[PDB]
């Protein structure tokens, strides 16, 4: 279908209304076909360097064959250079002749995943995969997924529209190799739109109800939201390091496109909450994030303690990045909210709420030196109330004696956190001109 | 009726579904080629700019392809400032795909807005941004604006020289960045600066993939700004003689063919002699075939009179020996081009010693007749038709050999 | 400060002499740069901690203030740090666009072949005069479109290029008129409509008149060639 649509795109002038009708029908029923990035990659350049390069190197290039590629690529740890030779000539090949080469590359990406290969070979494979994506996308997706399953049941097209997180069921080696991760991202985005279309068709078929449309909306929303969550967990650094930057860049790009397509999903992802280690790098990466200041009051007003903590930390890093008067009003609201929770919270949850949100206060104070005396008043109030708790029940390390300057008691840890954040505010303000 | 079609397409645009919006958008070019009325064109284009400013990026690609298709009606647009204000106003978006699409549309609007300084500046800034898809879209947009303007071309040649020396971006982006220098044929000093840049480029990057595009852009630049054709020819002959890469030599073939077809009178005697020496010293039949095709074209043109203009015998000239030996060479195409050269020189020049060449040419001619008569290949029939062109041209130019050539053709019958 | 504010009054009241407004602001900044230094935070809103919204690019008032700023910053170096990021890219755009209004700065973001060829082609024709009428026709056509291309290509050689080009067109026209088949056909017929020779005579006379009078610099050697 995609290749014929491209040919109709070429021969628009002869065909009267057929190109219109077909492009309307694909935009009605096959959005994962009519995604935009593949089409712009089709539009390419009219610098004609590809055409001249093809016309002056394809010639008689000693008849490279899929079986020869298979032999050299099965003996690839003995011979990488012949493989890279062959796929160089394959990138020189055109879009139509590439089809008999679809079997080999996909089904044998496992030794590519093995460490030690050069990413010139990897990027050559990536560019060939883009070209096969603009020619024959659907079988390409099927072979790619069924060959990227970890080291083996064989998924089908209908199963992939049913459950596209199977695309994310792949190697942690896939997760930490950059360009194959880009291939995975394309398949993920495509199959999400495909799942929307397929649930659409299945509900319209099964009618032989209003709860059914709402169930469709709920399932799709939770669906792409869970996909986003898996992607962010991929962005989390593993315990082993304790490539990653490029992987985080690719996932930030895909999240950017999803957020632009639907800002409801930003709302739902932020209400669900994700690791705050992921929070600052995602803040730096995703540019279409500053819609968050629309709903940060709602996430503050949510009754869950974990959600209120997450909202305050998100607001902190937003106010580091963009300093808007809108963000300043939201910050003032957050500070008064924090005062209110200080008025109403018992001591165990006081520890569990006020340990994580203090670097948010130093973020506020970095953003807005007008919003400064309120911060200091709240800091002194939370301080002396925690010191009064330390006084109430007997302790050992005695911050009252420590005044003139592990796993301990909670109020001890809270007082230490408070004085550390005061130290950070002061050092910040001294060095910050 | 035309107005009726206009606002029903407007209602299709105002419809909720992006499928139907795409329908109406891609339906406009039929309406352009049906109703050439200019007020209708202007209103349709304004609605296009509105939907492009607020569409969901697939509508944006559809509008882009609509403009790129029905480009020819662009010159009858009235409200240019408003159209460009919308289309340029959507370039501040943070979406790299949207920025790339907008820059491609500006490359398409190059026919009506070639002076917009803000468009120049936005293209130049996105040229050294990092997002890949917008970098190549910026390259395409520069490739169009540099064709229909001049000051933008001098800005881009300075920026391109800076980037290529500045060593950032990989070799593929360098390949995309080179062909901008074809549109430097607006002035001689820009041509000379670009020429120095390209000579530096080839000497700085001895790679086949570099050299092929560098030479091809350099030769289109000279053939357009035809001031340094002798420098171009002698550089190409240097690379045909010296560089051992067979693909690069085939580039030299397919480029000297272009120069010989465009500007034959600029070909000089030393150029012909150097190419002839190279065609003698080559080992390879295919490259000799290409050089012989080049000599066949030059022999068909006027330059044979330049090569045989006095103020060295014609027999002492190196062209004749090469022509004879390649006409009697084993390979069929080589023999065909040799007899082409012989026929051309015989009809064209009339000196006292050329009668032996006439006899040699006609006898090698029935050699080609017997070979192509009993070869029976598609290429064989092509060389046969070439030989028969040689027959018609030789017999019409010189009626002296007519009875001989007719009786030979009867023996072949 | 007040000169600026009523100059902006004038520009927003009579938006036609903005070119003279920009050039006089340029001359003011070049004449004395150091006066404007305290106004730099005030004239352009640069709120001491906020992200100020990006100013309009082609707004004539903002252009008028920017050109004064850059002409001030020609000498004094103590305000690139005062600039914001929009000011950086706007300096790039203004230096791109109005080359004679803003000078070169030190911002961190922004750090006779033709005559010989004409002579060579003309002497090529003059030397290759002694050959076949057909080859003369193709050589004349080739050189005619060549010199026409050169006249489009340059400006100061355009007149002489077009003059020699129309002279070669003259000569080609006469040679075609001579090579017409009327001379092959016997005298008493002279049928009809083959008088490309006569149309050639009219065109060649008109071109000689044109070549004499429409051009500016002609000397008597050229004139007697014309006659």
């Amino acid at each position: 279908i995609k290749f014929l649509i491209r040919q109709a795109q070429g021969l628009q002038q002869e065909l009267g209304g057929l190109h219109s009708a077909l492009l309307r029908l694909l935009a009605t029923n096959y959005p994962h076909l009519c995604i935009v990035d593949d089409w712009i990659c089709e539009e390419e350049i009219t610098g004609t360097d590809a055409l001249l390069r093809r016309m002056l190197l394809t010639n008689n290039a000693k008849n490279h064959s899929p079986k020869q590629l298979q032999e050299a690529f099965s003996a690839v740890p003995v011979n990488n250079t012949q493989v890279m030779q062959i796929i160089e000539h394959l990138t020189l090949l055109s879009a139509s002749e590439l089809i008999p080469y679809a079997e080999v590359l996909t089904s044998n990406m496992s030794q590519l995943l093995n460490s030690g290969v050069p990413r010139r070979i990897l990027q050559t494979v990536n560019k060939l995969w883009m070209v096969l994506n603009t020619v024959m996308p659907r079988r390409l997706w099927v072979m790619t997924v069924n060959a990227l399953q970890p080291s083996q049941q064989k998924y089908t097209q209908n199963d992939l529209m049913i459950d596209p997180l199977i695309v994310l069921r792949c190697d942690q080696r896939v997760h930490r190799c950059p360009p194959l991760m880009d291939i995975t991202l394309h398949m993920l985005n495509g199959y999400l739109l495909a799942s929307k279309a397929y649930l659409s068709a299945h509900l319209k078929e099964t009618e032989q109800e209003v709860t059914r449309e709402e169930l469709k909306n709920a399932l799709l929303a939770a669906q792409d939201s869970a996909a986003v969550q898996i992607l962010l967990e991929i962005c989390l650094p593993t315990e082993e390091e304790k490539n990653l930057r490029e992987v985080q860049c690719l996932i930030c790009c895909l999240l950017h496109q999803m957020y632009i397509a639907d800002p409801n999903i930003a709302k739902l992802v932020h209400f669900q909450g994700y690791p705050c280690e992921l929070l600052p790098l995602t803040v730096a990466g995703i540019p279409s994030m500053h819609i968050c200041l629309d709903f940060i009051p709602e996430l503050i007003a949510q009754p869950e303690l974990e959600k209120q903590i997450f909202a305050i930390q998100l607001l902190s890093h937003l106010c580091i990045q963009y300093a808007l008067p809108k963000s300043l009003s939201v910050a003032r609201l957050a500070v008064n909210v924090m005062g209110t929770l200080l008025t109403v919270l018992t001591q165990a949850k006081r520890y569990a709420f006020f340990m994580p949100t203090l670097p948010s206060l130093v973020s506020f104070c970095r953003a807005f030196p007008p919003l400064y005396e309120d911060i200091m008043s709240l800091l002194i109030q939370i301080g002396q109330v925690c010191a009064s708790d330390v006084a109430t029940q007997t302790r050992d390390i005695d911050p009252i004696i420590t005044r003139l300057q592990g796993s301990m008691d909670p109020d001890v840890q809270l007082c230490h956190c408070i004085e550390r954040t005061v130290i950070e505010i002061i050092n910040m303000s001294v060095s910050g001109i | 009726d035309a107005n009726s079609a206009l606002m029903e397409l407007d209602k299709g645009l105002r419809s909720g579904k992006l499928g139907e919006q795409c329908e109406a958008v891609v339906r406009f070019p039929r309406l352009f080629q049906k109703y050439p009325f200019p007020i209708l064109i202007n209103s349709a284009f304004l609605k296009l700019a509105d939907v492009f400013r607020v569409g969901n990026n697939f509508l944006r690609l559809c509008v882009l392809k609509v403009t790129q298709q029905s480009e020819k009606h662009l010159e009858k647009i009235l409200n240019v400032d408003e159209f460009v204000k919308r289309i340029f106003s959507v370039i501040h978006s943070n979406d790299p795909v949207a920025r790339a699409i907008t820059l491609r549309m500006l490359g398409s609007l190059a026919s009506i807005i070639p002076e917009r300084k803000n468009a120049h500046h936005s293209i130049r800034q996105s040229l050294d941004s990092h997002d890949n898809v917008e970098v190549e879209a910026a390259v395409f947009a520069a490739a169009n604006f540099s064709a229909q303007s001049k000051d933008f071309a001098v800005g881009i040649c300075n920026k391109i020289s800076e980037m290529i020396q500045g060593l950032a971006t990989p070799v593929d982006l360098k390949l995309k960045l080179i062909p901008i220098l074809q549109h430097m044929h607006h002035d001689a000093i820009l041509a000379s600066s670009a020429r120095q840049l390209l000579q530096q480029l080839v000497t700085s990057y001895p790679s086949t993939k570099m050299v092929i595009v560098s030479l091809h852009t350099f030769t289109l630049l000279a053939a357009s700004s035809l001031v340094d054709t002798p420098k171009q020819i002698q550089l190409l002959l240097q690379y045909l003689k010296n560089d051992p890469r067979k693909a690069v030599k085939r580039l030299a073939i397919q480029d000297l063919k272009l120069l010989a077809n465009k500007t034959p009178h600029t070909w000089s005697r030393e150029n012909i002699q150097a190419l002839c020496e190279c065609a003698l010293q080559t080992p390879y039949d295919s490259l000799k075939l290409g050089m012989l095709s080049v000599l066949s074209t030059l022999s068909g043109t006027i330059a044979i009179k330049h090569y045989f203009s006095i103020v060295s015998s014609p027999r002492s000239s190196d062209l004749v020996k090469l022509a004879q030996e390649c006409c009697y060479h084993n390979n069929r195409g080589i023999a065909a081009h040799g007899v082409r050269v012989l026929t051309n020189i015989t009809v064209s020049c009339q000196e006292k010693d050329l009668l032996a060449l006439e006899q040699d040419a006609v006898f090698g001619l029935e050699s080609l007749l017997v070979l192509c008569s009993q070869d029976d290949s598609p290429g064989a029939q092509a060389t046969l038709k070439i030989a028969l062109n040689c027959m018609v041209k030789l017999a019409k130019g010189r009626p002296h050999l007519s009875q001989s050539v007719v009786e030979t053709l009867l023996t072949q019958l | 400060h007040l000169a600026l504010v009523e100059l902006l009054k004038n520009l927003t009241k009579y938006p036609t002499d903005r070119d003279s407004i920009w050039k006089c602001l340029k001359f003011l900044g070049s004449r004395h740069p150091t006066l404007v230094l305290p106004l730099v935070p005030e004239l352009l809103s640069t709120h001491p901690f906020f992200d100020t919204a990006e100013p309009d690019m082609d707004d004539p008032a903002y252009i008028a203030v920017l050109v004064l700023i850059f002409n001030a910053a020609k000498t004094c170096p103590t305000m690139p740090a005062l600039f914001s990021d929009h000011t950086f890219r706007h300096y790039a755009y203004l230096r791109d666009s109005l080359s004679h209004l803003v000078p070169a700065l030190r911002l961190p973001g922004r750090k006779d072949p033709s005559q010989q060829f004409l002579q060579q082609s003309l002497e090529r024709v003059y030397s290759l005069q002694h050959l076949d009428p057909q080859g003369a026709q193709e050589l004349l056509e080739f050189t005619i479109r060549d010199l026409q291309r050169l006249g489009e290509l340059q400006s100061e050689l355009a007149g002489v290029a077009d003059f020699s080009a129309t002279y070669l067109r003259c000569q080609l026209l006469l040679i075609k008129a001579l090579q017409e088949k009327l001379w092959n056909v016997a005298a008493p017929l002279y049928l009809k409509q083959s008088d490309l020779a006569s149309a050639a005579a009219k065109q060649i006379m008109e071109e000689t008149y044109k070549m004499e009078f429409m051009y500016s610099g002609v000397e008597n050697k050229q004139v007697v060639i014309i006659h």
Binding site: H290, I291, Y322 | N94 | -
Partner: peptide
């Protein structure tokens, strides 16, 4: 409000 145009960018006037 304007999910894709960024806050530190000029408005569109009409």
């Amino acid at each position: 409000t304007s999910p894709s145009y960024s806050p530190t960018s000029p408005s569109y006037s009409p």
